[PDB]
């Protein structure tokens, strides 16, 4: 009768041979018990094939779980942050294995620990020496912009329209000093809108930009379909002028971002649907973390998330420990350009580049760009003098003194 | 404002063009300048491409949000349930572009609309037209096995994990004479180094073609090949070619667009497995219902869908299992019915609940004790689930036919 068999200290395991997962979870009854049934119920107790506790912390004793879930168990409550070391032999270098084992049925179904939530994992080397990770990454999307020591500015073109004036609206962006147009990722393969007529007006609109401005342009496309009609997305929208490629990463699925990872031409960078459905409980679920931290994993160059901003649905603190997953070394697993959208405009860019510390983020304008007073061109333009502002280390508004675009944002 | 071009009358649109979306939510402020910005968020207004409130119920004010959202919106809150007509124009017969579209950035970020559960999914005939759904069904599962006019008896063959694909093939073997249908693979061994796919299905689809020699009855030997989805055809034909008659895919972890790709490929039935789906299925008014998952691996077309069953200790309330089981079972389009599989606290001693609840024998039986951990063994453990069905056949107790069948009446004395 043991327990104590799901039990080991850190030093006494081959740790290049174990996952190390983080959980919160509220357990009913005694607390040993419940973790070692968590462990069993998520592998087994074999040596070699037994996930075991390597740490927990008991937080607080509760009058009642977070949530209401159904359960005949018997005892008292307590709140636990739990570490546990798992053995990657059982699952291998496969995305949809690794999910089954530590977020899948024992994760959630262990009688006696109703509510859970996986908090981080953190992969050895040797795990990593299996996967490829982004192909671009920060550094790859820099040198095709060649946009360096500043952050990359992107622009969601609206409304979505014909390919044609999705272009005129696009091209004005470019001009006035936008690095990325992209798509939105509602708007993918439909019947107004295909790929192969966006993808060509929209690819004729980028160069003609990059030599209107003598810079280089990025057309974003939303490749976003079922996972064998991707690769002959890609070859379409890379064979129009699409530079860089959008997928709807959860939607998809995780192992399909990394088959196209695998084929891509292009940088690939993911949006965030889906994931609130499972991250937002403070106390069950998945961390949002893990996610962009999978993505990244999973071989995307950027990841879109929520940002900063009052009326942005994400705590502060977990937008800031996304951006770290993004860019955080990771055995030789490039970083990728983490790209924080909330409530951003001109007049925000300052308080995220301070919320960052750094330039490696994506900026996009939530309003002001298409919506700017002057047109989208004068909208991209005030993003610009913002930025200049900065560098110089001077205020938004005394620089707007001698800049109109950027006044006429300071107006509203 | 035109908060009143998000409403329409379910009569003045063609429904045929339309998906119905059910959703439990907690507004923040004007109710009906809330619902606007959530059609709103979700699509566009176009008259084309504007997802439109049909009907709303304003269920209650609340003082409070049932979870602690970080929120800047001000004002009254109450819970609704809402019935939005999308239409389906804006994303087309794509599993991740609905998904994108229903519980997507508009979904759950509305200024407004900190708590959300979608709840349903009701597609039209048109919608459905362009997907194959379930290539065998119930009734493709039923023609291979024989069986008609009872459950289809499940077993997971254990200890799950660490076994010699010889050691594994032993017991099976055991289970299938006994009468148990299906020797399942656990939904955590797939394709791994100590006991790779082509090993097990090998020794595997030996044994069962001699259990089908011995007892001159069909069995199946159900083969996980979750894997990443490159991967997902060549494990199809290696687990195939050696005997696996059905497989077995972590639908989730795979993702719905894979197991239709697989479904399309596939020579034999696909069954789904359930992990993941608590994660965003659990909270009673927030994610996503379970029930939509399962309308959506059946549209995808899995043959059969494992999910949380009944007793008390499964997490999963009762009326939330039963709307599962419809899900697989109830008209949709041509969409053939798969089989629902509801895994509980089950043994020989709950078959007839089981039958009870469920109403019909169109349900797939797995028993967690009393077969493999029988006390005579695995044979006498499947023997019992089938002296146990006798016994409802008959319309007999299960402790009255336990006095002239003593592998049930072991299970009745533990």
Known sequence: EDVKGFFASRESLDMEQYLVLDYYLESVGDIETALAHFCSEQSTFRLVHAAKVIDYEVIEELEQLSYPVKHSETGKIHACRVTIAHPHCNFGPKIPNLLTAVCGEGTYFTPGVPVVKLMDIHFPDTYLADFEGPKFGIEGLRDILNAHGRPIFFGVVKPNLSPGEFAEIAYQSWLGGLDIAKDDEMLADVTWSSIEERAAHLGKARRKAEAETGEPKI????????????????????????????????????????????????????????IASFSRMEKYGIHSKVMTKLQRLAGLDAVIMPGFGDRVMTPEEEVLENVIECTKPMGRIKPCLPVPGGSDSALTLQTVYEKVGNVDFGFVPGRGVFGHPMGPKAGAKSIRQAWEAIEQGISIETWAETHPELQAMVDQ
């Open 219 to 274: 057309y974003l496309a939303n490749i976003t379909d079922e996972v064998d009609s991707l690769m002959e997305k890609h070859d379409v929208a890379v064979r129009n002028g699409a530079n860089a490629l959008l997928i709807n990463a959860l939607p998809v699925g995780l192992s399909a971002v990394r088959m196209l990872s695998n084929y891509t031409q292009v940088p690939l960078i993911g949006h965030f649907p889906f």
